[PDB]
Amino acid sequence: AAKDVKFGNDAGVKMLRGVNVLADAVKVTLGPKGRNVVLDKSFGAPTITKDGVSVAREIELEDKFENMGAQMVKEVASKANDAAGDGTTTATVLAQAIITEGLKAVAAGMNPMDLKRGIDKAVTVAVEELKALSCSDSKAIAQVGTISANSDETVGKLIAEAMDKVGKEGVITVEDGTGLQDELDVVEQFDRGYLSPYFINKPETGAVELESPFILLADKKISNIREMLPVLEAVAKAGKPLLIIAEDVEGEALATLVVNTMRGIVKVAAVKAPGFGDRRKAMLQDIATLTGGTVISEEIGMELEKATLEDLGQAKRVVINKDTTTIIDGVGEEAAIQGRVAQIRQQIEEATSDYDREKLQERVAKLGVAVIKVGAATEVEMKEKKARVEDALHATRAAVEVVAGGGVALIRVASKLADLRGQNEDQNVGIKVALRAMEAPLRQIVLNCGEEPSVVANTVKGGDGNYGYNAATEEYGNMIDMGILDPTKVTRSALQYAASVAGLMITTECMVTDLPK
Amino acid sequence: AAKDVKFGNDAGVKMLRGVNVLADAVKVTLGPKGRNVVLDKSFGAPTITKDGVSVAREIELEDKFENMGAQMVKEVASKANDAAGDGTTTATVLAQAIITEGLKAVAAGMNPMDLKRGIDKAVTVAVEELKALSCSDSKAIAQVGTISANSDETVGKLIAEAMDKVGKEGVITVEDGTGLQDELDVVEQFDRGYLSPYFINKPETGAVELESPFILLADKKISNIREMLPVLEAVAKAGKPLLIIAEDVEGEALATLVVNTMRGIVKVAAVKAPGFGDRRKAMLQDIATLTGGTVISEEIGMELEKATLEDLGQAKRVVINKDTTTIIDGVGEEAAIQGRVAQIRQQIEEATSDYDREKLQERVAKLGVAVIKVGAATEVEMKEKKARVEDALHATRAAVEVVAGGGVALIRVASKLADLRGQNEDQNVGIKVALRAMEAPLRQIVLNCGEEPSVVANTVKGGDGNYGYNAATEEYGNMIDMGILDPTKVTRSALQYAASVAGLMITTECMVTDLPK
Amino acid sequence: AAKDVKFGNDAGVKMLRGVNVLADAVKVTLGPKGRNVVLDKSFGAPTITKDGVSVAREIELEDKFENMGAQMVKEVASKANDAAGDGTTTATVLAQAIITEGLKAVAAGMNPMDLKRGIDKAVTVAVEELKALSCSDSKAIAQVGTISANSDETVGKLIAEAMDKVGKEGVITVEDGTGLQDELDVVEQFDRGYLSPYFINKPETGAVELESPFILLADKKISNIREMLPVLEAVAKAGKPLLIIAEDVEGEALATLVVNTMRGIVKVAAVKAPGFGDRRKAMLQDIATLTGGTVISEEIGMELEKATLEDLGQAKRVVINKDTTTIIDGVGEEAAIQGRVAQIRQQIEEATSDYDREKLQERVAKLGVAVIKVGAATEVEMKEKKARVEDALHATRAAVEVVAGGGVALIRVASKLADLRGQNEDQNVGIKVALRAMEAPLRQIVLNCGEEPSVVANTVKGGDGNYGYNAATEEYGNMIDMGILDPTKVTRSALQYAASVAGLMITTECMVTDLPK
């Protein structure tokens, strides 16, 4: 359709307004004194939140261009959430700060490209400086978990031990307990999410759950639909849920499965094979050995139509997040899986490239799941405990993949980079833009407290090291001694993502959108 | 869709107007001199009420933001109604008073967080002070019941004895009498309501009633629909009504059942299993023993499809309120149920944690229903008597879960807390905001009488103890001697819920809603 | 949807306008000199009436609030019509008068509650005073009947004898004659109307007529539809009409029957069982004995599906009014019915409570119908005679359940209550409001004549006793000697209903309605 095009400054103003609308709505929920935000529910009473992520999801503007700006900075929160699993609001306040001052410098005549270069330089030097000041050990892992579950020491300990058993990389799932106590057991996960939403049968978690499903392993991309019908019929009996782990399921057959899940029971859930090219099919073999199935390869491609339930692997349970699929308890234990492990473990011995050995080591490391059965007290208490552990786990994993909290770490880092220079004046301005934005988080936390940000900032900048401002007690002191910590992971992730999106927007010279007319 | 966002004061004004529209409409019906409110019926003559709850349900505003405020304070009434079962209008007048003065203090510059803290402190000290001045014994239980049934001593006595027989926790139901007199008999209830409305075949009571229904007990969450079809067909003969007490019925299979109840007879009604985790399935076993059925567990999950009518328990009648399900007269009396009781009663002896014993004690306490057959006079008189006992019972249960009425209790409590202070000025203001709101109920009762609230309030505050103002006779005197009492339960519940919702609104800094454009 | 709320005066004005629009339109048809009102027919020539009830039914206003007021006062006419069966226009003029002056006093500052109390006091003292001045005997019954049939002495006599044969409580029906003369015969009725309209196959009478229908007697509430299908099929042959006298037919199965009556022949008509609780089912047994059927009780509930035509009672004819169902000529005469009478007649001997004996006496009194075959002259004359007797009967029954007419009775009553006082000034004002309204009827009758109401009123108030104004001859004199009488029943009913609705409106402080926007 007819488009609307805006260049330079005209496009810059529309972007700035859009980011301000989103950022302002989000930033009010920062810190222990974060204010509430009312999100109008389609039906019933409105939602009350202090959670930034929840607020951002609702932000969409009428002005096509402003909305573009809001959707661009919304990428900061989502990316930081996907990486660190926390600190999205901090990322949003940092992004806005860099964009605000960045665009103002552009309007002043500064070179967009130079500005970006200066900002990027400040961020690289900042992250390394952040490392110097610095969630690896179980002490920290247990400390983060408890914090994520309202100081519940029980939950933090369960997570720490869970990660200590299967490694801070292994698959971990939370299940219901069987009469009090807290159980932990490894009962025999790849980076692939559902090819399309809607498969999400549990909207609250944004994940797909399948109980005792069959797993169709294919080495080709499904698009034909029709030749899949005979396999679907076979799965329609007993094991209702079906998990398709093919090379890829094209929009053709994929759209058919999506339309079939609606109304027609649980049906099927589709994801793509882990890895690519050569290692893709060898990786599929590992899944086949776990689940006890047969991979329908190129030559067996004709067989895709006459694939019996014997060729379909099976598992006790499977959970598919946005970008992670975990197969819990596969059917083909010991003998099969262990023999597979013996082969690959012998592959590393066949010394070739150091690369191969690393990749093969990842495979043997993958071939079980560690289930955490929660404290089964009464009935409702067990449901809450599971809700606590579930959220606390998710937050700890992101925290794993500490520095003084309250935004003092970034301020302390900015003080060190005061002499940082670039190749020119514009690059120097960009550097200072980044350093001024590193004060934004603390200033916003203080602003929400009802105190003057300029004063508190000045005082903390006057202090040294872990000297910061406790927004909870309205008192200054040693942040770490007061227990106000931030994983170095969430802090650097928030800064890096804020700077990348901000860098893109500052480098933008033209915007195109469908005309309202 | 595109949203509309408002911050601070802009959002505060919209909220205040919304709460004022709801509160003002509701508060006119407070006390013995409560005014009428006309609710326009879609068809026929408009509804005339002095019942606050009925009025609030109709309140919905055009301005998206104002409506948000109205729906927020509407939560006070609903929560207080769910807890105390009375005093919703009092709760609404208290909420408005706290919100009005709270937001005004915010606009004046006060710190929202500090204000909330002061209010909360005043409420905690107030409730304990309220306890000092203080529906446990049967005297009070019988006194409340009569009051709920227009001074009908007959009804109050039936309820008092009913609660004395199965305990003020046990299940009680009202049925039709068999030729005059008033019968009471325990004929062999968990906190779970219908997973979705529409199942409510009796709109007047807001509950679901099933006569001689089959009870499908499952230990897994239903979502497949299809595998439920064979069981539904079996129930389609003889025992038309079906009650599904599964771990949970997901929106998939749930939505199918909801669409099937419409037009297709009574069909099925769904609720979730009592408790959670470990005790959930042990609790299901107790229901299975009562109804004489078999619980379809994890392993028996495949059997869910081939579950015969022999596995389905059965009862004489079942009533499902918003948050309570009561199974009246199960089929499997004596032997089965009594043996089950013997096991659990022997579990408490096996001393482990004091916790377990408490939970196990709750189970043995649960394993009958006490039916109240009303005074069967003529025909229509019996219908009214049942209507009286039914409402009087509901109000008494909430009253169970006394202080001077006429809003004098809260005023007397506020006088004691005159020296209450906080950590700062803002916290002191919040405290006073709460104390000024404690006069609202009496002032509103007097306002409806046509008398000057400031004068009557001043006079009662000048008195001592139970000295209050009788709004019915327009005379001052000892409230308790005049028979104007209020259950301490309804009073503290009204104050606590008013303060919580008010605390949230005062802490709100941003509102988001779908744009009208 | 979004609502519109109005308080106090704002709501009072909207109500007053609405009542004025309805009352003014209605009151022009009062008395012998009543003016005509044109009611626009959807198709064809407009309706011309001097009948107030017909006019009121058409009144509906655009302004949501004003319409609420009109629909509220419309309740006066309908209630008085249901009780006295006449005097609706008088009731409407009384209501308007009380509401007009009542609301004006409220706006003046008077206390709404006090006002209501004064009005109520004036009405109670007025009705007893009305009794002192006072359709029991057959003389009056015959006098009212003739008056209702245009002075046709024939009709008045038939009704008087009909009521003398089965009592002024017994069931009476009008049928076509068989060759001149006027027959009267008792050929072997409960307070229950059709559960839903639409069943009304005769719109002109607002009643349902069934010829030789089967009667399904059930002791449970039907809602299942499906289990009723087999019984409906059995009735689909021969005896097309079906009458369901169950405990109650819930909206589920009820809505299905309503949709089936449309297009699908006469089908079924549903009503609920007479009485409630214990006496409900004993009362059903009495109907079963009359019609010669079997009552499907609780235990026989399963049999509801396999209920043969043998279990269905049968009658010659059945008529279901708004609130009355009459079974004409049941099949099971003498032996069956007489034996049933012997049991209950022996129940009264078993002296227990005086209450039981009264209720049992009502049952034996109920166990026939008195048919009135009209003067069969030519063909068309017989149709008119039946139309006369039918209307004259209906009016006489209401008249049974005399004082000077022309509104002089109420004026004479108001003169006596001139010294009536209350507990305060506001209560005294309310009293006077009621006394001034008692002149409204006469003033309106005179106003329609074209004469000055203030003058005629003054003159009648100057007279004594039955001294009144004959609006027909435009002459003063003794009302009773002139034959202008009013049943004390219609007069007190008109006043009481006018005062009750007026009391509610004056006590109204808030109105809520769906927003036009």
Swiss-Prot record, chains A, B, C:
One of its GO terms (biological process) is protein refolding. Its EC number is 5.6.1.7. One of its GO terms (molecular function) is isomerase activity. GO terms for cellular component: cytoplasm. SUPFAM superfamilies: GroEL apical domain-like, GroEL equatorial domain-like, GroEL-intermediate domain like. It catalyses: ATP + H2O + a folded polypeptide = ADP + phosphate + an unfolded polypeptide. It comes from the Bacteria. NCBIfam families: GroEL, PRK00013.1, PRK12849.1, PRK12850.1, PRK12851.1. Belongs to the chaperonin (HSP60) family. This is Chaperonin GroEL. The gene is groEL.
